[PDB]
Amino acid sequence: VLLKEYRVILPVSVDEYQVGQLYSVAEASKNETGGGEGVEVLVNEPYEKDGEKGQYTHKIYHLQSKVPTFVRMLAPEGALNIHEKAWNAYPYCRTVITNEYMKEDFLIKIETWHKPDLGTQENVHKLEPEAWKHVEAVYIDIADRSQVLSKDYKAEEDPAKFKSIKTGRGPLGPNWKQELVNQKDCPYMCAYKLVTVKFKWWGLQNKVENFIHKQERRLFTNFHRQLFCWLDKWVDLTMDDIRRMEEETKRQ
């Protein structure tokens, strides 16, 4: 099993990131016809354990209605049931994704620490030493065009081409992180997203784990480029605003 820590350094604050990430999930899913239908909340409850106080959820995403009929007839029982278990104690969060038919043999776990630094901490997740020694650190730089697939590139989601009206932040150049250390004002943080991918069937562990990690890097990159370029849409929201928009979207 292969573990990698993606460090996403961002020119927002931790506080800002919370709001921005919630907004961006909602907003980037706002053109998907077929979103929300088939989502099933099994559990939604508070929890508390040794400093981590938060909200736990257990949700199922039924893909039966979203795939061709022959997929839904050919799929082994439960293979189209995606389980997500989530512990949100922001600035820390853990999510575990499984497949009902794969049981625990196919697993994607993301554990994130959101810290007000430039991604300089080592083993921020406090792994056992030998285990830590086998974790690759992967830096994601949202300004760097060479980290984007050409098919994914969108000028309107390019931090190198965006300046924020409300904050004047951006556009981001290759020295933006350096000018953060030499700055006294603009906030910054780093999301330390430790991703574990497990695929125990058919001796395909290596292939699938590598494919999933590549896709996760691509998604983390595109998502946070979007998140920065939407700064003007969400930087003035509070958490209460976000909860209100959630309830609003709940009516339908």
> 21 or 99, CB closer to Ni ion?
99
Whether residue 249 is annotated as binding a ligand: the answer is no
Q: Which two tokens stand for residue 12?
A: 């927002």
221 labeled part of a ligand binding site = no
Minimum distance of Ni ion from residue 40's CB (angstroms): 4
- The one-letter amino acid code at 67 reads V
CA proximity to 121, closest of 131, 130, 112: 112
Pairing of strands 135-140, 2-10: parallel
| Whole-number Cα distances in Å, 11 to 112, 143, 162, 185, 215 | 17, 11, 13, 11, 24
Which is nearer to Ni ion, 63 or 237 (by Cβ)? 63
Q: Of the candidates 29, 39, 40, 154, which one interacts with Ni ion according to CB under 5 A?
A: 40
In angstroms, what is the minimal distance from the CB of 71 to Ni ion?
A: 18
* Interface region with Ni ion, contact rule CB under 5 A, candidates 34-42, 70-78, 198-206, 210-218: 34-42
Span from 32-40, 49-57, 173-181, 230-238 in contact with Ni ion (CB under 5 A)? 32-40
* Residue 193 annotated as part of some ligand binding site: yes
Please check whether residue 23 is in contact with residue 233, taking contact to mean a CB–CB distance below 8 angstroms: yes
67 Cβ neighbours under 8 A, 6+ residues apart:
75, 80
Nearer CB in complex with Ni ion: 1/42: 42
Q: Which residue is nearest to Ni ion (CB)?
A: 40
- The answer to whether residue 179 forms part of the interface with Ni ion (CB under 5 A) is no
CB-nearer residue toward Ni ion: 42 or 71 = 42
Which residues form the interface with Ni ion (CB under 5 A)? 40
Binding residues: 57, 59, 84, 88, 95, 193
